[PDB]
Design a protein around this ligand. Sequence first.
Ligand SMILES: [Cu+]
Ligand SMILES: [Cu+]
Ligand SMILES: [Cu+]
Ligand SMILES: [Cu+]
Ligand SMILES: [Cu+]
Ligand SMILES: [Cu+]
Ligand SMILES: [Cu+]
Ligand SMILES: [Cu+]
Ligand SMILES: [Cu+]
Ligand SMILES: [Cu+]
Ligand SMILES: [Cu+]
Ligand SMILES: [Cu+]
Ligand SMILES: [Cu+]
Ligand SMILES: [Cu+]
Ligand SMILES: [Cu+]
Ligand SMILES: [Cu+]
Ligand SMILES: [Cu+]
Ligand SMILES: [Cu+]
Ligand SMILES: [Cu+]
Ligand SMILES: [Cu+]
Ligand SMILES: [Cu+]
Ligand SMILES: [Cu+]
Ligand SMILES: [Cu+]
Ligand SMILES: [Cu+]
Ligand SMILES: [Cu+]
Ligand SMILES: [Cu+]
Ligand SMILES: [Cu+]
Ligand SMILES: [Cu+]
Ligand SMILES: [Cu+]
Ligand SMILES: [Cu+]
Ligand SMILES: [Cu+]
Ligand SMILES: [Cu+]
Ligand SMILES: [Cu+]
Ligand SMILES: [Cu+]
Ligand SMILES: [Cu+]
Ligand SMILES: [Cu+]
Ligand SMILES: [Cu+]
Ligand SMILES: [Cu+]
Ligand SMILES: [Cu+]
Ligand SMILES: [Cu+]
Ligand SMILES: [Cu+]
Ligand SMILES: [Cu+]
Ligand SMILES: [Cu+]
Ligand SMILES: [Cu+]
Ligand SMILES: [Cu+]
Ligand SMILES: [Cu+]
Ligand SMILES: [Cu+]
Ligand SMILES: [Cu+]
Ligand SMILES: [Cu+]
Ligand SMILES: [Cu+]
Ligand SMILES: [Cu+]
Ligand SMILES: [Cu+]
Ligand SMILES: [Cu+]
Ligand SMILES: [Cu+]
Ligand SMILES: [Cu+]
Ligand SMILES: [Cu+]
Ligand SMILES: [Cu+]
Ligand SMILES: [Cu+]
Ligand SMILES: [Cu+]
Ligand SMILES: [Cu+]
Ligand SMILES: [Cu+]
Ligand SMILES: [Cu+]
Ligand SMILES: [Cu+]
Ligand SMILES: [Cu+]
Ligand SMILES: [Cu+]
Ligand SMILES: [Cu+]
Ligand SMILES: [Cu+]
Ligand SMILES: [Cu+]
Ligand SMILES: [Cu+]
Ligand SMILES: [Cu+]
Ligand SMILES: [Cu+]
Ligand SMILES: [Cu+]
Ligand SMILES: [Cu+]
Ligand SMILES: [Cu+]
Ligand SMILES: [Cu+]
Ligand SMILES: [Cu+]
Ligand SMILES: [Cu+]
Ligand SMILES: [Cu+]
Ligand SMILES: [Cu+]
Ligand SMILES: [Cu+]
Lengths: 121, 121, 121, 121
Amino acid sequence: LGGVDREAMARCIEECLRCAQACTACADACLSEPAVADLTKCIRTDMDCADVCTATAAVLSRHTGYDANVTRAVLQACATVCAACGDECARHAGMHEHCRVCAEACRSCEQACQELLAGLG
Amino acid sequence: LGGVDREAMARCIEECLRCAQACTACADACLSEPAVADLTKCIRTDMDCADVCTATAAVLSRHTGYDANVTRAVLQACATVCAACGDECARHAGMHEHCRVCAEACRSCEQACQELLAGLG
Amino acid sequence: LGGVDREAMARCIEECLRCAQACTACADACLSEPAVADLTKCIRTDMDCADVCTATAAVLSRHTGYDANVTRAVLQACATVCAACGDECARHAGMHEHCRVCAEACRSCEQACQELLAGLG
Amino acid sequence: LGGVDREAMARCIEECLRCAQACTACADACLSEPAVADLTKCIRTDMDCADVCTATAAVLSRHTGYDANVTRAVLQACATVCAACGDECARHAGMHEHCRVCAEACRSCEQACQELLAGLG
Ligand SMILES: [Cu+]
Ligand SMILES: [Cu+]
Ligand SMILES: [Cu+]
Ligand SMILES: [Cu+]
Ligand SMILES: [Cu+]
Ligand SMILES: [Cu+]
Ligand SMILES: [Cu+]
Ligand SMILES: [Cu+]
Ligand SMILES: [Cu+]
Ligand SMILES: [Cu+]
Ligand SMILES: [Cu+]
Ligand SMILES: [Cu+]
Ligand SMILES: [Cu+]
Ligand SMILES: [Cu+]
Ligand SMILES: [Cu+]
Ligand SMILES: [Cu+]
Ligand SMILES: [Cu+]
Ligand SMILES: [Cu+]
Ligand SMILES: [Cu+]
Ligand SMILES: [Cu+]
Ligand SMILES: [Cu+]
Ligand SMILES: [Cu+]
Ligand SMILES: [Cu+]
Ligand SMILES: [Cu+]
Ligand SMILES: [Cu+]
Ligand SMILES: [Cu+]
Ligand SMILES: [Cu+]
Ligand SMILES: [Cu+]
Ligand SMILES: [Cu+]
Ligand SMILES: [Cu+]
Ligand SMILES: [Cu+]
Ligand SMILES: [Cu+]
Ligand SMILES: [Cu+]
Ligand SMILES: [Cu+]
Ligand SMILES: [Cu+]
Ligand SMILES: [Cu+]
Ligand SMILES: [Cu+]
Ligand SMILES: [Cu+]
Ligand SMILES: [Cu+]
Ligand SMILES: [Cu+]
Ligand SMILES: [Cu+]
Ligand SMILES: [Cu+]
Ligand SMILES: [Cu+]
Ligand SMILES: [Cu+]
Ligand SMILES: [Cu+]
Ligand SMILES: [Cu+]
Ligand SMILES: [Cu+]
Ligand SMILES: [Cu+]
Ligand SMILES: [Cu+]
Ligand SMILES: [Cu+]
Ligand SMILES: [Cu+]
Ligand SMILES: [Cu+]
Ligand SMILES: [Cu+]
Ligand SMILES: [Cu+]
Ligand SMILES: [Cu+]
Ligand SMILES: [Cu+]
Ligand SMILES: [Cu+]
Ligand SMILES: [Cu+]
Ligand SMILES: [Cu+]
Ligand SMILES: [Cu+]
Ligand SMILES: [Cu+]
Ligand SMILES: [Cu+]
Ligand SMILES: [Cu+]
Ligand SMILES: [Cu+]
Ligand SMILES: [Cu+]
Ligand SMILES: [Cu+]
Ligand SMILES: [Cu+]
Ligand SMILES: [Cu+]
Ligand SMILES: [Cu+]
Ligand SMILES: [Cu+]
Ligand SMILES: [Cu+]
Ligand SMILES: [Cu+]
Ligand SMILES: [Cu+]
Ligand SMILES: [Cu+]
Ligand SMILES: [Cu+]
Ligand SMILES: [Cu+]
Ligand SMILES: [Cu+]
Ligand SMILES: [Cu+]
Ligand SMILES: [Cu+]
Ligand SMILES: [Cu+]
């Protein structure tokens, strides 16, 4: 905060919550496929991307005693995992609608994290 | 799942994520008030309501090997905490806009949990 | 708090953290089995039991403006899910060491939750 | 995984769970001090360090489709926040025992993250 883009922050928080949920729902949807054995990296990466988006949403929602070093590090982590997860689910976009929808959510939240991170100094 | 209201489920998941975030933001907004000393139960209850809504959103987002006993217990917990937190922040609705907004989110998600729980058998 | 068993509380918090981790590790260990297709309810229940134990540990770690109604509801949820997950992984105790170890952690934390819940009035 | 130090990994997971809990307990203990108004950055940083340690413990507990890029990014975030939080609570080590205990937990988990991160390539 201070010279930050408040609208870029709100987008990042909203995209994190959306993306955590998409990833949780994708993990579960894949567990239910008969194809489950071939979708285990996707499921694992989804579990991670949901955990990190959850944490990132909470970190970014707070302004008291804001420390840009913590914020940048957390946004970096979230961008890195959303990129990994985006590609991972994108692999199954032609197999399952859940994975193409989740791939879009990862990429969208990767963009939101990157956009915010850049304007943090 | 099975005879469940899919739209009541989606509302519950959306309201949980909205409410977790509102509560996290309220906790932080109160930490920043000069009035902080008088707002410590509100801050604590917000932290709890954010933790439980987070968990509830994730539990309700999953359908593989669904167990209605776990689901009902988790929805019960989330309703109970949203009721407690709703009243707690509602106390400061005439002091801070963050608390009146958060009070509405708690009550809204309390309703969503109760509505879903009722149709689970 | 007030007439509560402080040692029963500490056990509950410690068992929750242990159990969240055991469940996360079990979920992942099962995703890696060649048997994964037959272990999907176990994996799902593990994900839920890790989420609820995480939340319960945090709720129980807090004493400011303690509300026994929220605490009991949250402990109830955690006991219910640990019971479900205990039985679920116990099914694979003769197939995988991870599931027999995780089954013991669920049962242990089910006991800790039940013991605490009983002395809360 | 592969050329990784399995004992450094277990330490990191254990220290994260310990540290998440210490931070949650410190946040709450500070909310209860009469001194609360002067301890608001400590409380905020504790909330963040608990969220990130929670996520890090879960990420590090998983081996299926392991991606060292995600793992390093997440460990980096966790080290950065534990360093920030260590110093933040260390400021009140002569005021409250909870803050000196929590400061030690942050520093300990900062070390565990840094040690692991270094051997990941
Ligand atoms: Cu975000
Ligand atoms: Cu995200
Ligand atoms: Cu996601
Ligand atoms: Cu999926
Ligand atoms: Cu998948
Ligand atoms: Cu994902
Ligand atoms: Cu994510
Ligand atoms: Cu994120
Ligand atoms: Cu992300
Ligand atoms: Cu993904
Ligand atoms: Cu996929
Ligand atoms: Cu996926
Ligand atoms: Cu999917
Ligand atoms: Cu898929
Ligand atoms: Cu995704
Ligand atoms: Cu995904
Ligand atoms: Cu993602
Ligand atoms: Cu994402
Ligand atoms: Cu993001
Ligand atoms: Cu972001
Ligand atoms: Cu909900
Ligand atoms: Cu909620
Ligand atoms: Cu809320
Ligand atoms: Cu507030
Ligand atoms: Cu408040
Ligand atoms: Cu709340
Ligand atoms: Cu809530
Ligand atoms: Cu909820
Ligand atoms: Cu709730
Ligand atoms: Cu509230
Ligand atoms: Cu309030
Ligand atoms: Cu509040
Ligand atoms: Cu507020
Ligand atoms: Cu307020
Ligand atoms: Cu609220
Ligand atoms: Cu609130
Ligand atoms: Cu609430
Ligand atoms: Cu709520
Ligand atoms: Cu709700
Ligand atoms: Cu709900
Ligand atoms: Cu517990
Ligand atoms: Cu537990
Ligand atoms: Cu467990
Ligand atoms: Cu397992
Ligand atoms: Cu399993
Ligand atoms: Cu479990
Ligand atoms: Cu559990
Ligand atoms: Cu628990
Ligand atoms: Cu439990
Ligand atoms: Cu289990
Ligand atoms: Cu199992
Ligand atoms: Cu299991
Ligand atoms: Cu297992
Ligand atoms: Cu197993
Ligand atoms: Cu278990
Ligand atoms: Cu288990
Ligand atoms: Cu369990
Ligand atoms: Cu458990
Ligand atoms: Cu328990
Ligand atoms: Cu417990
Ligand atoms: Cu760790
Ligand atoms: Cu940590
Ligand atoms: Cu900590
Ligand atoms: Cu503290
Ligand atoms: Cu503090
Ligand atoms: Cu901390
Ligand atoms: Cu931490
Ligand atoms: Cu950590
Ligand atoms: Cu850390
Ligand atoms: Cu700290
Ligand atoms: Cu402190
Ligand atoms: Cu602290
Ligand atoms: Cu403290
Ligand atoms: Cu202190
Ligand atoms: Cu600490
Ligand atoms: Cu601390
Ligand atoms: Cu810390
Ligand atoms: Cu830490
Ligand atoms: Cu650490
Ligand atoms: Cu670590």
